[PDB]
């Protein structure tokens, strides 16, 4: 007999909710992988995606 402090067991999450931005277009893997004439290593190029 007495008073005791109990932990969480009653409530458990089940539902998965996901929110994502409205970006819809396919991202250009074609013009960066299937291209022609990549530069040499000393003159490498940056591309912002």
């Amino acid at each position: 007999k007495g008073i005791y402090q109990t932990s969480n067991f009653r409530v458990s999450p089940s539902t998965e909710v996901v929110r994502f931005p409205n970006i819809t277009n396919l991202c250009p893997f074609g013009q960066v992988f299937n291209a022609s004439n990549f530069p040499s290593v000393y003159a490498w190029e940056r591309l912002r995606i």
Partner: protein, 50 residues
């Protein structure tokens, strides 16, 4: 010899603590929180929290 001929009555105030505040802690929501991926990992460390 020196002998007093009068007297005075004084009141002295002294203080000292008796008790502090009672506190309690829960390991499962301090160390992890709501993450069940590390509840099982905290279960492997024994009985420190008891």
């Amino acid at each position: 010899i020196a002998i007093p001929t009068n007297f005075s009555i004084s009141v002295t105030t002294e203080v000292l603590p008796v008790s502090m505040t009672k506190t309690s802690v829960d390991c499962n929501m301090y160390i992890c929180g709501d993450s069940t991926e590390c509840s099982n990992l905290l279960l492997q460390y024994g009985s420190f929290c008891t």
